[PDB]
Design a protein around this ligand. Structure first.
Ligand SMILES: [Mg+2]
Ligand SMILES: [Mg+2]
Ligand SMILES: [Mg+2]
Ligand SMILES: [Mg+2]
Ligand SMILES: [Mg+2]
Ligand SMILES: [Mg+2]
Ligand SMILES: [Mg+2]
Ligand SMILES: [Mg+2]
Ligand SMILES: [Mg+2]
Ligand SMILES: [Mg+2]
Ligand SMILES: [Mg+2]
Ligand SMILES: [Mg+2]
Ligand SMILES: [Mg+2]
Ligand SMILES: [Mg+2]
Ligand SMILES: [Mg+2]
Ligand SMILES: [Mg+2]
Ligand SMILES: [Mg+2]
Ligand SMILES: [Mg+2]
Ligand SMILES: [Mg+2]
Ligand SMILES: [Mg+2]
Ligand SMILES: [Mg+2]
Ligand SMILES: [Mg+2]
Ligand SMILES: [Mg+2]
Ligand SMILES: [Mg+2]
Ligand SMILES: [Mg+2]
Ligand SMILES: [Mg+2]
Lengths: 67, 144, 60, 185
RNA sequence: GGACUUUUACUUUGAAAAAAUUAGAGUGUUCAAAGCAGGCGUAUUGCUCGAAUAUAUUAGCAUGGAAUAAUAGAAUAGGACG
RNA sequence: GGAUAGUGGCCUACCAUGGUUUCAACGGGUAACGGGGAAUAAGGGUUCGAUUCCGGAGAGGGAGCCUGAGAAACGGCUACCACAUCCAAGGAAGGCAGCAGGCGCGCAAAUUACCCAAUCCUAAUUCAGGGAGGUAGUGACAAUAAAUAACGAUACAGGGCCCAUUCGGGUCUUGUAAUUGGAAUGAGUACAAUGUAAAUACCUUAACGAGGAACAAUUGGAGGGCAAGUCUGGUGCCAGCAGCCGCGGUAAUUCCAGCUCCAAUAGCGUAUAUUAAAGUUGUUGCAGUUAAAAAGCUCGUAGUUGAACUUUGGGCCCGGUUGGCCG
């Protein structure tokens, strides 16, 4: 079997120059899993239809629930 | 020297003159006049898929004696009407009027094939199946 | 020439030829092995030289 | 947008399709060297076809031409290095002659057979594809490997399989499991 | 630097020149189509060859050739030299 | 002069009558984007290039324009034309020749999936974004390697060969065998680790996994060209075959089957196109008395073509690159 390998001049040296998937493979880093990549895209697009904070927009629709 | 100008500067005459006589070539003419696209039932396409109008027994040419069992087809991209032979004993019972057949050429470069007069094509599929499969057993004609 | 002659007999002969099922037979080897079977049959042991050679002979 | 992954094919096909002489001649090559195809003959005569071509082309240039020297000697040394071209005939009017069997005689299909080890070129096939018979410790399962004449000393069975020891294999190790059960405990 | 020079065709060599394709060298991708790799030890602390070459014309440019084939020159001398 | 970033009939004013063309202008066609290139292998050619690189053009059709270094931009706006969605009828919105996916068209073409790990690109920027791109799926477009078996034993039959007065079988195996014999292997299945961004496959490899009921090769053909039956049964100028020549009207070497056989073989057939065969487009290289083809005749412009002759011969020098005989 022919591979390739690295050895780092410290442990904290490896953790900063190494890919963040490699440390995951090993157990030296967690995999913080997020929304599906096309799920985030849609969340950005929904975030584009608002101008400003968006909690200020909630109150004007709480007036809609009367009229 | 009989004809063709041999001089070193006669190229123009030489290509002009050859450009002329290429029109006596049947294929060069056909390809440049676009006879494929202009005339002919297929568009120049490999095959074409029409719809069966009637069923014809065709009386074979001499010195044969037979009834050749073809189908009148109206090409779907055209409306051009075309008569087409149904090969392989039976297979006329495989078609029906208004059935949807896919026709190919006869491999004569236009040019009707056998004792069959006028027929430049042949059926390949009916109802999207292929007569071959139906003729042997490998497939069944679809429902409707 | 007549274009409307009878269709009644379409499929005639094939319908009325007496059925014969296939007969179960030795399996033939595939690929290289079949070529060997052809080599030894054609050349190695030969068979018959009668007048020259035959391939699909009947009664002779 | 990529680089085209390139290719080319390895065989040419005979002009006249039915020739009793050529079909007789061809089958006899498959019979001798253990081929499954007429394509395996087609493939080789196509290789030969271009080698003769390159040699035909060089032979027309002047002797001691820079190109004729560089590419002529290189073609030669490669045909020696595999063992098709004889060491005496090394000057390439033989590469212009040659013939198909000289290439066929160099196949790992045949060289596994040539010194013992096979006995019937067909048995040579079955062994090759079945991961017996290495060259180095490297197993090679292609019958067409073309023994390179200095790897010829090294064709033995593999560090694996029977015949090279370090296991019988499952058919035998199934029968060893019916002796210590029926006749044993 | 000053002062002037009949026009060409052909042919030679060369420059300017994309890569992939093609032709083709080297390399054993297990073979091969390919790829541009790879090959060596002290395999515990590196050593090392590569990643060529060819075509690339018609036109333009640069150089050599003076056969072949054109072209111009002096006859009311308004000639050539100084 | 105006306009341009700037040259220019770019535009305007004034002035002139010019510019192109049988060496084919202008016009028409193009089922025309151009190029690197592709197919065909004596050479010369013929044919093709929408399409992985370069250039150009476009974003339903036209025109216009804001922003900006850069756009006459369309995943920017404005208008008109054509489409077309929502509605409370007041109005409002849209531009897949991006990635998928649907309709339609047809002979004709795949997933509404995963990822920024690589390749590179952009930003204020090592971080974020990237349907660029990579990953997998669909996938006989094409291209590569090449399993469907291999080895003994035996029962006779040989063919050898020593001997033959004559049984004959005996050792050297030729192989056709209706009982046999133990071997081998991945096709699959699958611990595991490898692989990968995470998966999937491949390469590795535990446990498994071949005897005819498989784990069972096809596709065409068998009168000629053209490789392989004059077998048997069917039909009886019908049904069908047949690229071409031709087969079928009762013993069909061409049909419909069975048997057997041939060629190519994980592929093989048909249709269409094109190339070679084609020296049937002929520069290389055709033909024209009678087979297709010399204009009834001469003149003649363009075009092609066009006799011979002008430093030839002699002498010396210089230094190269092969090859000989010696080294
Ligand atoms: Mg005419
Ligand atoms: Mg006739
Ligand atoms: Mg009618
Ligand atoms: Mg239409
Ligand atoms: Mg002016
Ligand atoms: Mg167009
Ligand atoms: Mg084109
Ligand atoms: Mg193009
Ligand atoms: Mg073109
Ligand atoms: Mg188009
Ligand atoms: Mg559209
Ligand atoms: Mg318009
Ligand atoms: Mg626009
Ligand atoms: Mg868009
Ligand atoms: Mg855009
Ligand atoms: Mg309202
Ligand atoms: Mg397709
Ligand atoms: Mg089995
Ligand atoms: Mg068959
Ligand atoms: Mg024959
Ligand atoms: Mg009979
Ligand atoms: Mg038959
Ligand atoms: Mg010539
Ligand atoms: Mg002729
Ligand atoms: Mg005549
Ligand atoms: Mg002259």
């Amino acid at each position: 079997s022919v591979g390739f390998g690295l050895v780092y001049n410290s442990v904290a040296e490896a953790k900063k120059f190494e890919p963040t998937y490699r440390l995951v493979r090993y157990g030296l880093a967690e995999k913080v899993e997020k929304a599906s990549r096309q799920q985030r895209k849609q969340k950005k697009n929904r975030d584009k239809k608002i101008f400003g904070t968006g909690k200020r927009l909630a109150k004007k629709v709480a007036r809609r629930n009367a009229d | 020297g009989k004809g063709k100008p041999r001089g070193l500067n006669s190229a123009r005459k030489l290509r002009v003159h050859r450009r002329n006589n290429r029109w006596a070539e049947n294929n060069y003419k056909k390809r440049l006049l676009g006879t494929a696209f202009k005339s002919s039932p297929f568009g120049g396409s490999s095959h074409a898929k029409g719809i069966v109008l009637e069923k014809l027994g065709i009386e074979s040419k001499q010195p044969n004696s037979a009834i050749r069992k073809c189908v009148r087809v109206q090409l779907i991209k055209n409306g051009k009407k075309v008569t087409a032979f149904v090969p392989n004993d039976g297979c006329l019972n495989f078609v029906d009027e208004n059935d949807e057949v896919l026709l190919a050429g006869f491999g004569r470069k236009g040019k009707a094939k056998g004792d069959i007069p006028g027929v430049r094509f042949k059926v390949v599929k009916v109802s999207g199946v292929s007569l071959l499969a139906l003729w042997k057993e490998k497939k069944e004609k679809p429902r409707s | 020439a007549k274009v409307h002659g009878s269709l009644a007999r379409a499929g005639k002969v094939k319908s009325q030829t007496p059925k014969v099922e296939k007969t179960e037979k030795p399996k033939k080897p595939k690929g290289r092995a079949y070529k060997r079977l052809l080599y030894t049959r054609r050349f190695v042991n030969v068979t018959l030289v009668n007048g020259k050679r035959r391939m699909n002979p009947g009664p002779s | 947008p990529r680089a085209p992954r390139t290719y080319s094919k390895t065989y040419s096909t005979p002009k006249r399709p039915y020739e009793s002489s050529r079909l007789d001649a061809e089958l006899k090559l498959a019979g001798e060297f253990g081929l499954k195809n007429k394509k395996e003959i087609y493939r080789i005569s196509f290789q030969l076809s271009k080698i003769r071509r390159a040699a035909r082309d060089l032979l027309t240039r002047d002797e001691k031409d820079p190109k004729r020297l560089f590419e002529g000697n290189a073609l030669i040394r490669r045909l020696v290095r595999v063992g098709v071209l004889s060491e005496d005939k090394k000057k390439l009017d033989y590469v212009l002659a040659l013939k198909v069997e000289d290439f066929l005689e160099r196949r790992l299909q045949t060289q596994v057979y040539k010194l013992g080890l096979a006995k019937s070129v067909h048995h040579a096939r079955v062994l090759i594809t079945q991961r017996h018979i290495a060259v180095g410790k490297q197993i090679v399962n292609i019958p067409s490997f073309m023994v390179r004449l200095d790897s010829e000393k090294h064709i033995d069975f593999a560090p694996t399989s029977p015949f090279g020891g370090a296991r019988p294999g499952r058919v035998a190790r199934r029968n060893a499991a019916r002796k210590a059960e029926a006749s044993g405990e």
